[PDB]
Design a binder for this molecule. Structure first.
Ligand SMILES: CCCCCCCCCCCCCCCCCC(=O)OC[C@H](CO[C@@H]1O[C@H](CO[C@H]2O[C@H](CO)[C@H](O)[C@H](O)[C@H]2O)[C@H](O)[C@H](O)[C@H]1O)OC(=O)CCCCCCCCCCCCCCCCC
Ligand code: CLA
Ligand code: CLA
Ligand code: CLA
Ligand code: CLA
Ligand code: CLA
Ligand code: CLA
Ligand SMILES: CCCCCCCCCCCCCCCCCC(=O)OC[C@H](CO[C@@H]1O[C@H](CO)[C@H](O)[C@H](O)[C@H]1O)OC(=O)CCCCCCCCCCCCCCCCC
Ligand SMILES: CC1=C(/C=C/C(C)=C/C=C/C(C)=C/C=C/C=C(C)/C=C/C=C(C)/C=C/C2=C(C)CCCC2(C)C)C(C)(C)CCC1
Ligand SMILES: CC1=C(/C=C/C(C)=C/C=C/C(C)=C/C=C/C=C(C)/C=C/C=C(C)/C=C/C2=C(C)CCCC2(C)C)C(C)(C)CCC1
Ligand SMILES: CC1=C(/C=C/C(C)=C\C=C/C(C)=C/C=C/C=C(C)/C=C/C=C(C)/C=C/C2=C(C)CCCC2(C)C)C(C)(C)CCC1
Ligand SMILES: [Ca+2]
Lengths: 30, 25, 51, 129, 204, 37, 93, 240, 40, 449, 27, 34
């Protein structure tokens, strides 16, 4: 059941991406 | 193939077409 | 037919290379049989490194 | 340095004839006999051994030119001019309408000289590319 | 470490790939055997004088250039724990030509089985395609006789067993193996020599 | 082949289709002659 | 299978296993390919090589050539592995 | 429907699925004469399955995986009266079809729907019935190779990916023997047609067939399963 | 499927030891950040 | 203006200086047409000069002569090129006309007036004048319709066209009864482009071709008249960008699409592109190999309908997913092939096994051999065969040249479409030269988060 | 001897371009 | 299977109509310089 680990890692990456997009700290103009 | 497909396609298309026609008016 | 390099030993040959060839278990990698290697057996080297 | 006939006829071949023969071979034969295997029937190729074991044996110039004139099966028991390009069937195989006797002998010269220079490569296939 | 030195003994780190490349140990064993023949001894008596250790060095499973980066563990995890030297297999055709099985080079993960004579001429092999083949052991008729080791003075004439010992022969000398103790997966692993060389080259 | 008459005009025809390419190249020449390019 | 005793009689040897060998093998003996080889395969298998001559639809030419190479033939027990590919055995060049 | 199919063109049939269907006979009256002295021949024999049952440890229903490529057609045979009994001996035609079904659980069951070497005794009217035994060759043939290049007539003779396994005396790759020794396993399913429609004018028969048969073994690596095909058949009677 | 068991450990340990590392840094970073932004 | 200072464009983008100069632009177009006709003539004379009587067209690297042969010039029954003189005629005509168009081009480019709106009013135009543009469009559409009717006339009355499906082998035929039925023609139009369908590339008879050109002729003429005598509706005026670059981009997209379509025609169709002239298709060649060895092995005594391959599928004969009897092996993918040398053996349920056993003709075997040995595979340096093949046969099928070249062209033309459409939008709105430092849109927008 | 004719014709065309340019460059 | 086809057809026609009639609604006017 290495499939569990692979799925876990993939879900991890996708979650990281999701939070990188919708939970980024907003860029602020000088 | 069946008449149902053409019916639905022409239905949705005509609906959006009318929406657009109102907009154009 | 089962020397250290067949068994994945990585620090053993380095202890062997400079003199430490005996164990407190009474054996040797040369094939001989010792009864008292003294302080500097494999186990001795390990424990001294720990201390 | 090939075989002219079945009677042991031997005549040397100058590179002029080898050039003309190679060119005409590549122009008229050298699909299939792209390389003298036989793409439309790999069972019967242009390798020396296969040629010698035919009936009549196409191990010589005269036999080869004879084959180009009127081709037969490997056992010589039937004609295959309606399937294989030949002078006898140059009406349905128009590519054969421009070949003379010198041309046929040049092509045959090429076919027979190849196994002497390339050895196993001639009729050998992709194995020896 | 990779080329070998007085400070990297083969009894501590294992043999080198170049020793298999040049047939170092093979040539040595042949020399000793021929010397024993000069002393009046017979062939199996000559090969019986050969130590299991020397014969073990002439085995490609102890070649450090036959492993894999992610094949973890000791070499015993691959072929198993070496139990016996079976002895030297000599192959012969029906004419009495001494056939040698073409040894696997370190480059090849697998290698076609070809039995070649003293002049490097193909006398036997194990055909991929069976039809129209002309060198199969079933057709050529080859025999295998062991000299020295556990299978000393045993002869095999049946095609099955000869083919068997032929594959095994392409790997060098043949040995016994315990693959139950460590649940060996049947794939070659590198020596401490290889791992050391890898780690330190990349670290460098 | 060509009609027997215009046989004599074989080599010239061999160069005929290569002419449009030349025109492309000519543009650059023209430009280089002016001062641009 | 791993082992087959009659491998040499498949084309790479001096004799031909009539019951199993491919038509291509019969190219070894002048006159047999393609007609005689065709009739031989189509009429198989045989208990003994001589049974080949007991086959109807064989011409006198066929029987002549076949006798010659009668001294050249063997009839091993037919194995479907090769028997199925007596015409096309996936070999070309 | 044979006349209907005759009237149809290729462009009218291509893609519809009709090309895999057996013709019907719109007549349940009359009889086809059979002189026990003259020899006959069954021609244009076409079975068309409809049901594929695979037995589990009773037969269970399956799902077809290989679409409309399963029907046998144009199969050819001698109809000879031997010692009074009527015998049909299958010869030529499209007398086999590799098809794959799927049993509950997801396991794919491939099999070679064969009718080769059929010998079928006849017991021709709407009460005539055809029953009998048949050979089913190996699913793969000699030149076929597994994902590791092993086959019957060619390929590797060992597990070439495991040289350290094939390296010691005795055992050996003897374990993997079961997978290194490819076997051509001829089996037998056994059919049982059964007529129901006879047209005397066109000398055409058709009706139900049952067939039983045996199935794929992966060159002797796994045990086969029993498969069950329930269908319609069509044929014509032609004098020799 | 016969896989190497240690892999499990490797992966998880590998993955989780830097992850924690990062998180630790991040949060304290932000804390300090906040403080400095507050007293300005 | 012919400088960076006077126009704003550099010497590269030099050609953009002609956007508002009607005269020189017209000169450019006419000169370019001159180049096209030049190439047509010169290359045609080249192909006629290099042609050899007793060899197939596709062995000699011809792409123009197969078109003329398809139209029915100098062709004998079967696809034999007997008379090579009309080709010479067309080549000469095109060449001389190229002299005329060249003169006009150079004149309007260098000698004549830059602006045709001053001295003239019929040949002058503003890009923003919708009526004038639709007028020109209408005129040229009518011209295209006239051309379609030229093909129709040529095929109906003047000799006819080469029909590869002709009852008796390929031969020139006058199309007596063209297809005018809308169900059929427009059945082509509204059909899938996928396997077994083929959209408009799947046209397999000259009746439908010529009838289709009748329909397209009528459509183009009626549309031309429509655009000449009308003005664009409100919705079209609101939806489109009305400038020269925009029109250029539209025509570019159109020509990209057409390029792709032509590549597909050259690759799959063997009716408008007879295999006698253009060579076999990939499908046709693969099927030809399967056919060839089916025949060879059947002659060697094998019952091909019962011959089991290594996989368990038919070695020579199997079934298509919809039931049709097809050739086995990889060419199972090519079972949609229709070829005049194979259709004799075709039945209702696919290939007729009886006809395969009994009625296969020698000429069919010759066709199969020829085509499988002239498959559209070859290297860039024209080494015939698969990539691993050795140097002996000098051959690359015309189909490969045509299809690849026109994919190249269609592709880059699409790129040009994106480029010019984008620049058209940006130039219309007014920011094609950069962002206004005093009117940066983003700065007037609420931040994303 | 056909090659020389080909190369001469080629030379003449190729030269034809630049000559027109040079000629107009003088005026 | 037919109902699935009807569904997918409905979706495709819907989004395609929105695309076409959407891009017809004076799209060039949708710019920051208007
Ligand atoms: C822009 C990027 C866009 C990316 C893709 C966007 C999403 C598209 C989603 C759907 C795409 C479907 C494409 C199918 C194209 C195809 O299979 O096309 C094949 C068809 C022809 O179909 C064939 O038609 C044949 C007709 O021949 C038959 O009839 C003939 C009549 O003589 C002969 O008899 C012949 O022997 C006989 O078989 C057969 O039916 C074949 O089975 C059948 O496959 O061509 C045609 O319909 C015309 C094809 C038009 C062009 C196809 C698209 C190419 C796009 C290139 C973009 C490049 C630039 C990108 C820049 C970014
Ligand atoms: C085939 C394509 C093509 C065509 C039809 C044209 C056509 C034109 N270009 Mg152009 N151009 C092209 C390719 C082309 N160009 C290329 C590839 C480039 C390189 C980037 C340029 C760069 C370019 C620039 C920079 C300019 C033009 C300009 C012009 C226009 C005026 C030409 C002029 O005054 O020259 C006069 C030329 C001569 C007097 C010498 C040539 C005389 C003839 C043609 C010699 C031919 C020889 C004969 C046929 C046989 C031998 C004209 C409409 C100009 C323009 O629009 O300004 C208004 C301009 O400024 N072009
Ligand atoms: C219908 C065809 C068509 C027409 C009329 C135009 C017209 C125009 N384009 Mg355009 N374009 C087209 C197709 C077309 N394009 C295609 C298909 C592409 C994609 C490749 C482009 C990409 C493009 C760009 C990127 C730009 C233009 C620009 C322009 C304008 C100035 C062009 C100029 O001076 O050329 C000058 C000509 C050259 C510099 C010659 C370059 C030759 C190329 C690089 C090599 C091609 C290889 C060739 C096939 C053979 C190789 C030679 C070998 C034999 C030695 C002008 C309005 C410019 C613009 O927007 O200005 C408003 C601009 O920047 N075009
Ligand atoms: C539709 C275009 C087209 C097609 C399909 C063909 C097809 C053919 N031609 Mg032909 N030809 C063409 C246009 C075309 N030609 C043009 C325009 C000319 C005038 C120069 C010629 C002149 C010509 C002659 C003189 C001969 C042929 C021959 C041939 C045959 C062999 C071709 C060969 O070896 O190619 C070679 C292929 C190449 C060299 C590839 C070209 C590289 C391309 C253009 C890419 C490079 C551009 C670059 C990447 C662009 C940069 C992109 C930029 C926008 C960023 C073949 C039937 C020969 C034959 O057998 O005829 C009897 C022959 O002798 N042709
Ligand atoms: C696309 C085709 C086309 C178009 C639209 C025009 C359009 C025009 N040409 Mg023209 N021309 C063309 C092709 C074309 N030409 C060709 C191919 C040649 C070479 C024979 C000429 C040779 C030509 C000459 C010699 C003259 C025109 C002139 C004119 C203008 C007035 C002619 C008139 O009203 O009648 C007009 C703008 C006249 C002009 O512009 O004078 C100021 C003029 O004197 N043309
Ligand atoms: C009623 C007015 C009228 C007419 C008849 C034409 C006619 C033509 N224009 Mg044109 N044009 C017009 C107004 C008109 N234009 C206006 C107002 C403008 C804006 C200034 C232009 C701008 C313009 C440009 C920029 C170009 C043309 C081109 C062409 C030619 C297309 C050739 C081709 O391949 O088409 C398709 C051809 C066919 C389908 C074959 C049959 C066509 C007919 C039946 C006969 C063609 C014979 C010959 C080419 C010329 C005779 C035409 C005449 C008798 C009608 C054609 C001669 C192009 C060209 O190359 O000109 C030489 C071109 O590049 N025109
Ligand atoms: C020569 C080509 C040509 C060109 C460039 C134009 C250009 C134009 N026409 Mg036009 N037209 C033409 C030929 C042409 N027409 C012909 C031949 C006819 C019929 C005889 C018409 C009939 C016509 C009418 C009746 C009207 C126009 C209108 C217009 C204008 C609006 C365009 C528009 O919104 O399109 C957008 C078009 C569509 C969204 C229609 C979709 C096409 C359907 C779906 C069929 C295509 C499906 C097909 C099977 C698949 C194609 C494959 C492809 C998608 C890859 C524009 C100026 C309109 C206008 O402004 O009035 C003047 C208008 O009312 N035209
Ligand atoms: C700094 C480098 C010092 C190296 C000393 C190595 C060492 O342990 O010597 C070991 C020696 C001898 O040490 C003896 O070794 C014997 C085996 O040879 C036995 O094991 C004895 O138990 C042990 O005491 O001790 C020294 O001479 C210390 C010298 C320091 C100077
Ligand atoms: C604008 C411009 C340009 C362009 C130009 C062009 C593009 C032009 C073209 C032109 C052209 C396009 C021309 C043409 C010409 C043609 C000709 C001049 C022809 C001739 C012909 C002949 C001469 C023929 C002869 C013959 C005959 C009659 C037949 C037989 C054979 C022979 C050959 C003898 C450029 C960019 C450069 C720049 C500048 C400006
Ligand atoms: C000849 C022929 C034929 C016929 C043909 C035809 C008849 C055709 C037609 C065709 C057609 C009839 C076509 C059409 C097309 C169309 C199109 C292609 C369209 C396009 C569109 C567009 C492009 C649009 C766009 C847009 C949008 C969508 C959004 C908004 C804006 C705009 C408007 C821009 C046949 C097949 C029989 C056969 C072969 C030959
Ligand atoms: C039809 C005909 C004719 C005509 C011809 C012609 C039309 C010609 C033309 C020609 C031409 C039209 C030529 C041109 C050329 C051009 C050139 C030659 C250019 C260029 C080159 C180069 C090499 C360049 C380079 C460069 C530069 C300078 C710039 C950029 C950079 C580079 C470096 C690339 C004649 C009379 C013979 C008569 C017969 C037929
Ligand atoms: Ca009944």
């Amino acid at each position: 059941m290495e499939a569990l680990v692979y799925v876990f890692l993939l879900i991890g990456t996708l979650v990281v991406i999701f939070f990188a997009i919708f939970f980024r700290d907003p860029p602020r103009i000088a | 193939l069946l008449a149902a497909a053409l019916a639905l396609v022409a239905v949705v298309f005509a609906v959006v077409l009318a929406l657009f026609a109102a907009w154009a008016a | 037919l089962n020397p250290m390099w067949r068994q994945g030993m990585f620090v053993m040959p380095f202890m062997a290379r400079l003199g430490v060839t005996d164990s407190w278990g009474g054996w040797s990698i040369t094939g001989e049989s010792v009864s008292n290697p003294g302080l500097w057996s494999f186990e001795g080297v390990a424990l001294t490194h720990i201390v | 340095e090939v075989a002219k006939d079945t009677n042991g006829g031997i005549l040397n071949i100058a590179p002029e004839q080898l050039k003309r023969g190679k060119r005409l071979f590549n122009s008229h034969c050298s699909s299939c006999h792209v390389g003298g295997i036989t793409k439309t029937n790999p069972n019967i190729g242009l390798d020396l051994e296969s040629l010698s074991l035919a009936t009549p044996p196409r191990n010589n110039l005269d036999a080869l030119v004879d084959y180009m004139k009127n081709p037969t099966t490997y056992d010589g028991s039937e004609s295959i001019a309606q399937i294989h390009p030949s002078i006898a069937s140059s009406d349905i195989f128009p590519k054969m309408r421009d070949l003379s006797e010198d041309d046929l002998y040049a092509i045959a010269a090429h076919i027979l000289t190849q196994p002497q220079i390339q050895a196993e490569k001639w009729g050998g296939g992709k194995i020896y590319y | 470490m990779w080329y070998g030195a007085a400070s990297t003994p083969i009894e501590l780190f294992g043999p080198t790939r170049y020793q298999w490349d040049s047939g170092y140990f093979q040539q040595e064993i042949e020399k000793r055997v021929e010397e024993s023949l000069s002393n009046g001894l017979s062939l199996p008596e000559a090969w019986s004088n050969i130590p299991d250790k020397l014969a073990f060095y002439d085995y490609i499973g102890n070649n450090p250039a036959k492993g894999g980066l992610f094949r973890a563990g000791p070499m015993n995890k691959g072929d198993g724990i070496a139990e016996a030297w079976l002895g030297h297999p000599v192959f012969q055709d029906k004419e009495g030509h001494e056939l040698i099985v073409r040894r696997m080079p370190a480059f090849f993960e697998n290698f076609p089985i070809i039995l070649v004579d003293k002049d490097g001429i193909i006398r036997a092999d194990i055909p991929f395609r069976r039809a129209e083949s002309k060198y199969s052991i079933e057709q050529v008729g080859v025999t295998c006789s062991f000299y020295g080791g556990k299978l000393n003075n045993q002869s095999f004439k049946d095609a099955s067993t000869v083919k068997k010992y032929a594959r095994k022969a392409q790997f060098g000398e043949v040995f016994e193996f315990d693959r139950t103790i460590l649940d060996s997966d049947g794939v070659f692993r590198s020596s401490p020599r290889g791992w050391f060389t890898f780690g330190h080259a990349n670290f460098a | 082949q060509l009609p027997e008459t215009y046989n004599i005009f074989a080599p010239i025809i061999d160069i005929m289709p290569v002419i449009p390419i030349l025109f492309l190249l000519l543009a650059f020449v023209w430009q280089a002659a002016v001062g641009f390019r | 299978r791993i082992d087959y005793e009659g491998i040499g009689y498949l084309g790479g040897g001096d004799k031909i296993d009539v019951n199993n060998a491919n038509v291509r093998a019969y190219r070894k003996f002048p006159g047999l390919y393609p007609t005689a080889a065709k009739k031989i395969v189509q009429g198989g298998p045989y208990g003994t090589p001589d049974d080949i001559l007991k086959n109807p639809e064989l011409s006198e030419r066929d029987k002549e050539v076949i006798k010659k190479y009668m001294d050249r033939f063997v009839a091993l027990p037919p194995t479907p592995e090769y028997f199925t590919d007596r015409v096309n055995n996936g070999i070309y060049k | 429907t044979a006349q209907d199919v005759r009237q149809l063109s290729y462009e009218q049939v291509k893609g519809t699925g009709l090309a895999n269907r057996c013709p019907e006979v719109v007549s349940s009256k009359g009889k086809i004469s059979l002189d026990k002295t003259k020899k006959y021949k069954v021609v244009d024999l076409c079975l068309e399955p409809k049901q594929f049952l695979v037995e589990e440890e009773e037969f269970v229903d399956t799902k077809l995986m290989t679409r409309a490529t399963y029907t046998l057609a144009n199969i050819e045979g001698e109809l000879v009266n031997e010692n009074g009994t009527w015998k049909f001996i299958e010869k030529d035609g499209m007398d086999y079809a590799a098809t794959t079904v799927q049993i509950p659980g997801g396991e794919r069951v491939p099999f070679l729907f064969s009718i080769k070497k059929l010998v079928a005794s006849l017991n021709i009217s709407t009460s005539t019935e055809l029953g009998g035994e048949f050979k089913v060759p190996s699913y793969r043939t000699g030149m076929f190779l597994d994902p590791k290049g092993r086959g019957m007539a060619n390929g590797y003779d060992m597990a070439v990916a495991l040289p350290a396994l094939e390296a010691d005396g005795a055992v050996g790759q003897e374990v993997l023997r079961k997978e290194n020794d490819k076997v051509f396993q001829e089996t037998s399913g056994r059919i049982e047609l059964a007529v129901n429609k006879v047209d005397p004018t066109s000398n055409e028969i058709g009706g139900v067939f049952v067939s039983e048969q045996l199935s794929d073994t992966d060159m002797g690596a796994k045990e086969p399963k029993k498969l069950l095909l329930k269908g319609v058949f069509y044929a014509r009677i032609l004098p020799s | 499927m016969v896989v190497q068991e240690g892999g499990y450990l490797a992966v998880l340990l590998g993955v989780l030891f830097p992850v924690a590392f990062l998180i630790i840094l991040y949060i304290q970073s932000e804390a300090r950040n906040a403080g400095m932004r507050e007293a300005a | 203006g012919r400088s960076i200072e006077s126009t704003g464009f550099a010497w590269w983008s030099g050609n953009a200086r002609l956007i508002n100069l009607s005269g020189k632009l017209l000169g450019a177009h006419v000169a370019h047409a001159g180049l096209i006709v030049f190439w047509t003539g010169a290359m045609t004379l080249f192909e006629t000069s290099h042609f050899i009587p007793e060899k197939p067209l596709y062995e000699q690297g011809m792409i123009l002569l197969p078109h003329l042969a398809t139209l029915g010039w100098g062709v004998a029954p079967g696809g034999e090129i007997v008379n090579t003189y009309p080709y010479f005629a067309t080549g000469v005509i095109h060449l001389v006309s190229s002299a005329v168009l060249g003169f006009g081009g150079i004149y309007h480019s260098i000698v004549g007036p830059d602006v045709l709106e001053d001295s003239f009013s019929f040949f002058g135009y503003d890009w923003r004048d919708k009526n004038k543009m639709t007028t020109i469009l209408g005129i040229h559409l009518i011209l295209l319709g006239i051309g379609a009717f030229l093909l129709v006339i040529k095929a109906l009355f003047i000799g006819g066209i080469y029909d590869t499906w002709a009852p008796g082998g390929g031969d020139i035929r006058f199309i007596t009864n063209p297809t005018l039925n809308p169900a059929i023609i427009f059945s082509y139009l509204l059909k899938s482009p996928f396997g077994g369908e083929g959209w408009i590339v799947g046209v397999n008879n000259m009746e439908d071709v010529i009838g289709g050109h009748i329909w397209i002729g009528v459509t183009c003429v009626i549309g031309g008249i429509w655009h000449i005598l009308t003005r664009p509706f409100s919705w079209a005026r609101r939806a489109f960008v009305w400038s020269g670059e925009a029109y250029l981009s539209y025509s570019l997209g159109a020509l990209a699409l057409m390029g792709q379509t032509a590549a597909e025609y050259a690759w799959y169709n063997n009716t408008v592109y007879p295999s006698e002239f253009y060579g076999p298709t990939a499908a046709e060649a693969s099927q030809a190999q399967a056919f060839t060895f089916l025949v060879r092995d059947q002659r060697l005594g094998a019952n091909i309908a019962s011959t089991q391959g290594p996989t368990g599928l038919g070695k020579y004969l199997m079934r298509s997913p919809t039931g049709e009897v097809i050739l086995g092996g990889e060419t199972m993918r090519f079972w949609d092939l229709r070829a005049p040398w194979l259709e004799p053996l075709r039945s209702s349920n696919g290939l007729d096994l009886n006809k395969i056993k009994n009625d296969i003709q020698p000429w069919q075997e010759r066709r199969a051999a020829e085509y499988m040995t002239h498959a559209p595979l070859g290297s860039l340096n024209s080494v015939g065969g698969v990539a691993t093949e050795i140097n002996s046969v000098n051959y690359v099928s015309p189909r490969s040249w045509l299809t690849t070249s026109h994919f190249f062209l269609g592709f880059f033309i699409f790129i040009g479409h994106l480029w010019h459409a984008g620049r058209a939008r940006a130039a219309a709105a007014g920011f094609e030269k950069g962002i206004n430092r005093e009117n940066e849109p983003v700065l007037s927008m609420r931040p994303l988060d | 001897w056909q090659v020389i004719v080909q190369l001469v014709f080629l030379a003449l065309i190729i030269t034809t371009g630049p000559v027109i340019i040079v000629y107009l460059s003088t005026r | 299977m037919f109902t699935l086809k009807i569904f997918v057809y409905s979706c495709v026609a819907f989004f395609c109509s929105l695309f076409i009639f959407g891009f017809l609604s004076n799209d060039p006017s949708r710019n920051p310089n208007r």
